[PDB]
């Protein structure tokens, strides 16, 4: 639905001259979370911001619902602006109403409702899962829920389009791994189409369907989440688990690690695994049937992006043709096999 | 002591002169929030320049003088430049710089842009969005406009002392040159309870 | 020429009147810190719930009001009731107030025990800790002293009268009575730039 | 060189006696990094206090290199106090002077000798290394920088105990990694005793000799470090890898796993090793003993103290007997395995 093409904009410091974004096009598939992600301060800030208009493309055409923006015409943006709601960095509430008035605050901006107010906003808090418990205080709750009073509101005009712009970011984690999963939720339910920014990686695996790259203001790669192997930047891809692991293993084992092969020793193993099932009995399936040992180094395994990943480092035990004969019968299996060094 | 009651009251007038200068022309002066160019919606061509300026040396300058001054003022303006009913308008203007400021700091005290990008959430535009600001704006000019009064009553002590009459006048006239315990020493205690009071009407 | 100058100079003197109490009156009972709330060192009790309440209710007071109350105390201290010598007197206490608390303030802004962690180090409270206290404390301090002169000066305005000398006589006096587009000018001008001076005197 | 003993230490609040600290017993030698962890807020927040005695300690005898300190001679702490220094919860540092004065107070303080401040700070900031090039800048530096002034300024004195308290908490990992080596230096030849304090075990696993465990003003276990196995605080004893617990940040599956136990479901079980050895391959035995498979959610080891810690999330499949003949063997075989649940 949410489409771009070219989007470029330029700073104008009026001496000066600053590039923001630099012919970035994106593909954003409707019924999907769709991240964008990038450097700590890459102008990722920007970009969300063309989606509706608040910064002006100084290059590019933007079509969300199919709709384009032009500058020129302001009452036709306003009318868009009801599709495409937004969220926010910190929470964004207004002080001045309780909980329920947040969330009605656009209802009565054009449409002017006597009564769905109660309506949209009830069921909103119902599906938020802040409503029925917390209704009655303003400003003032706990943290994490601060940012679902928001999201109502921006679910309030019940628009094919919600963004974010790193709002689990600020939350502690507890709260992180809840505000994204609402999403997913309203995701499930409305159909609702999502375009997410975000500082970290953790961010992306949890809900992101396809996610962005984005250094110093063009746009590196984009792909499904599962595929996202591309073009070196893995250190982002790093951040999940990969950063425990793989560069860390257990830190002082290297000294015992061999770069070459030698007398009476074990060849440690990266068991890098595919969207295998869950009961991945492999390595056990092993040791029954090829009379062989492991002694398991590190492992871990998550969804994200839709299809399991499991990656384990072991040393792997057994006759030298039992232990080679293992790596080939995992492999028809699908398990991808490594060796770093001989221990 | 027959003094002490309408003195009081002269001193409340005082506020009720202060309501139409505390906000009908001090507001005015707080369109230099408007007028800080970096966005903040409007703001063309430096205004800011020397709107603020001016405000700053009325504010900078001292009270009794002032009204002194202002009486050339005061005497064309309204009949008697020595009347306290006169005394209000020299008043309203001592007031007005540095209740101005008050307006721009209360509003920059509130959560910024944030709110502002509430423009993207409703429509918004121009009206609407002003709508927005009131309501936080509120809290903040109240809990100003309260401070403003206190201030401004203890200006109006000066007036009975001179320019008008007022509680001020009393304690001027019977401690002024009289020196009694009785009445003066009771003028700042009734004093003192008048200011709290406006605090109290704060909440 | 001969009228301005006699009178500046007595209003020079209301700075006299600071290096006078915003040492014995003003941080002398920034020994509220103590007595803030956890004894920050042994020097506290239920002293500052009525303590930081004279403060309060002396700051309650308005400053012409204050001093004709004065006026019969200014006469049994050291004073004939009437000029300078005797018109500090209730200046510095009028100021007592402003300048206590800014103390306060500055005493409290600085970073916690953090730096009591000195103790740790051996510190010894003395001058050792209080003295160092200080550096980080006059940037606060040095703000506030500053600020309570323009308060000050502006004090002596209100002066004028009675229980007053100076530049606010000469002021009030062709100001209240004698009104010259002329000199009350000066005077004005005199006062709006002497106050700026005050405030880049600071830094 | 730094003996608590029987030390016991309670607050009053006139309205109640609330307890703090309750008899508290320390061995830490001398050249040795003792760490001391505890629970939220569970008194170690008030101890490496007693130590230096900023505390005055109810009871016991605190000795520190000795001499016992009791609170009743300032004038002689004094003298002991510039003996045992002390870096910070927070930083510390006065905004109103330069790098080389914040170390130099000290030095300034007690001591007051015209050249040996300047070669000590300048030393000293060398030895932390804010200093060939920080001598001017004052204050504003980088946390780890604001820092090492500050433990620079504790060794100005020229101490022979440093105590440490929550150093590295407002200290992100990065930052965290090259303080604490910092620490390690100085320990290993300034033949500097440290005696630390804090939240995280990561910190203990750095530097850590002996250590002590503190829940409620009791301590749970003291020991070194390489044995420390035995007492309810696996967790943190399981300061893990995050590595471990991130196989429920998809909190999809933990909320898979049903608390209740059901027919017809498999368990999900923590397997702790406790010190076997490398040559501990036992789920793979059990693979071919029992017949039972074992899907690896998450799994971790580490050598922490010289040896490896070792935990493990995992899903065992099988009849009932067999898992049951699994869990048996193995803790038969020194594992200590609790079930979670069953997924």
Redesign the interface.
Known sequence: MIKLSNITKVFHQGTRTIQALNNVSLHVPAGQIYGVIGASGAGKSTLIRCV?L?ERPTEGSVLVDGQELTTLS?SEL?KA??QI??I???F?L????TVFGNVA??L???NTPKDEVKRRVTELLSLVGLGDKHDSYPSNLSGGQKQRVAIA??LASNPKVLLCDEATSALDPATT?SIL?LLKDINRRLGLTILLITHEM?VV??ICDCVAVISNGELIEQDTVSEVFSHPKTPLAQK??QS??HLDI????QERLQAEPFTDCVPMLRLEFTGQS????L???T??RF??????????????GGVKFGI?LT?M?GTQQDTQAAIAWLQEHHVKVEVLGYV | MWLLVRGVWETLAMTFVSGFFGFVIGLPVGVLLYVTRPGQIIANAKLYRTVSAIVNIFRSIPFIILLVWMIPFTRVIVGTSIGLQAAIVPLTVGAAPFIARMVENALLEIPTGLIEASRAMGATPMQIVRKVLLPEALPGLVNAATITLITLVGYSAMGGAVGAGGLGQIGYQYGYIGYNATVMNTVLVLLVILVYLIQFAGD
């Open positions: 509706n608040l302001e306003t602006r009801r709601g937004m926010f960095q910190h964004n207004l002080s001045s109403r605050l656009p009565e901006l054009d509101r921006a791994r999963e953790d695996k949890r999940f688990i425990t692991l257990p830190e002082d084992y869950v009961d991945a009995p390595l056990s399936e040791a029954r009379n062989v040992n492991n002694n398991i180094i590190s492992a871990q395994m998550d969804y994200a384990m040393e035990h």
